[PDB]
Amino acid sequence: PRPVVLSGPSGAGKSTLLKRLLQEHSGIFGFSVSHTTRNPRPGEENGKDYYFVTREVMQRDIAAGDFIEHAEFSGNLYGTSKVAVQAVQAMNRICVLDVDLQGVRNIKATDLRPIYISVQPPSLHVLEQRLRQRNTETEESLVKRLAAAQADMESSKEPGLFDVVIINDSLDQAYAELKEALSEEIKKAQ
Amino acid sequence: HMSGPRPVVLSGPSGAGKSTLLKRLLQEHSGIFGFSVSHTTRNPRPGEENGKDYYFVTREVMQRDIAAGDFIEHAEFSGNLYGTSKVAVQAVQAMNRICVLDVDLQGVRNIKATDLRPIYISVQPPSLHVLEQRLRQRNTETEESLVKRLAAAQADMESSKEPGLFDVVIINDSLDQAYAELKEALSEEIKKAQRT
Ligand SMILES: Nc1nc2c(ncn2[C@@H]2O[C@H](COP(=O)(O)O)[C@@H](O)[C@H]2O)c(=O)[nH]1
Ligand SMILES: Nc1nc2c(ncn2[C@@H]2O[C@H](COP(=O)(O)O)[C@@H](O)[C@H]2O)c(=O)[nH]1
């Protein structure tokens, strides 16, 4: 199955849509479990949301060549390990990736050959309004995420970068566009 | 040189407690040990979670995986396939954890011919009758499956005496007794993993 790379600004809803996509389509999709050095959030599960490792363990895995790609966000390391993608491929499931723009760039040079989907908010201020109204992290983490969102949004205008660009006006609308873009591949796996 | 921490292979009959023993070891020593998630073609039971207890796949998928070289070992047990994939072991090693595996007798013999070099521990029930009672009391098994598991279980206990096969044999009379024996047998293993 062709992998699916979900990107876009952090907080724009790509993870909410991803979770709904996997829950609605049992047996079809598998989530790529990235490594990260950031602290886990309450409710996040090691080996399910991320492989939560120390910086020392992350650098050792990097040096061993464990990662298809790795990146930095807010002073922490993230990466897609070969094992995380191979684990889904060994299930014959559609592997779904959730990475930032730099991950998209590096994945372009690999043999994965996925479909690239960007999940964009309607505007930078609407994204901040949604994240501030949530009020789930400090001003430092929020602003660091919003600063990264500015760069992620401007690059969605690059021709050929993303196969599909979804603007999250509402989560139901954005999910309907996600299912349409993957309709042929879902039908194939089904 | 003195060996460092090695993978841990637990074998013995299902229903004799090796899985519940392993879950206690994993939840109480998660800073040291990680679980190898085997593939199986048998159907999931209630309470089992794909990617945690097993990778539940079809035979067609598992055989294609085998042909692709994905597996360290694989075996046929009671009509279904089970196997330890390379990525299962590597995922635990990428976590800076020591891999613990739960396999049948064929898997023990399979792993002996690999470069894993684990410690081999056999978890035995008090008797075949107590095992037959525990198995049928847990249900989730056809009569044909229960019979095949009982016949495989007698081979388990007989193999526990084969010289040089297992490093440790634990008779699981009670879980607390069997767990304390498991930690004692893994005392040097835990020390080595914590010092690295
Ligand atoms: N390049 C790359 N980015 C990732 C990876 N995992 C998560 N990210 C991205 O890192 C950002 C921070 O993720 P969060 O910390 O909010 O989970 C998000 O944009 C997310 O998509 C990864 O494995 N590789
Ligand atoms: N050889 C081998 N045996 C396994 C593997 N995974 C589970 N088994 C064994 O297969 C038997 C049946 O497992 P159950 O169906 O009771 O979960 C048990 O003895 C179990 O330990 C594996 O990956 N390889």
Swiss-Prot record, chain A:
Active-site residue list:
41, 134, 145
Q: Which domain of life is it from?
A: Eukaryota
Tell me which EC number(s) this protein carries: 2.7.4.8
Q: Which gene encodes it?
A: GUK1
GO molecular-function annotation terms? Answer: ATP binding; guanylate kinase activity
Q: Which CDD domains match?
A: GMPK (cd00071)
Binding of ATP, residues: 11-16, 134, 168-169
Alphabetical UniProt keywords: Acetylation, ATP-binding, Cytoplasm, Disease variant, Kinase, Mitochondrion, Nucleotide-binding, Transferase
Instruction: Report the Pfam families cross-referenced here.
Output: Guanylate_kin (PF00625)
Q: Could you tell me which InterPro entries the record lists for this protein?
A: GK/Ca_channel_bsu, Guanylate_kin-like_dom, Guanylate_kinase, Guanylate_kinase_CS, P-loop_NTPase
Q: How is its activity regulated?
A: Up-regulated by RD3.
- Does the keyword Cell division belong to this entry? no
Q: Which protein family is named in the record?
A: Belongs to the guanylate kinase family.
Name of the protein this chain belongs to: Guanylate kinase
Organism for this UniProt entry: Homo sapiens (Human)
How does it associate, per the subunit comment?
Monomer. Interacts with RD3.
The linked condition is: Mitochondrial DNA depletion syndrome 21: An autosomal recessive mitochondrial disorder characterized by ptosis, ophthalmoparesis, myopathic proximal limb weakness, variable hepatopathy, and altered T-lymphocyte profiles. Multiple mtDNA deletions and depletion are detected in muscle, as well as mitochondrial respiratory chain deficiencies.
Q: Does the keyword Zinc apply?
A: no
- Guanylate kinase-like domain boundaries: 1-183
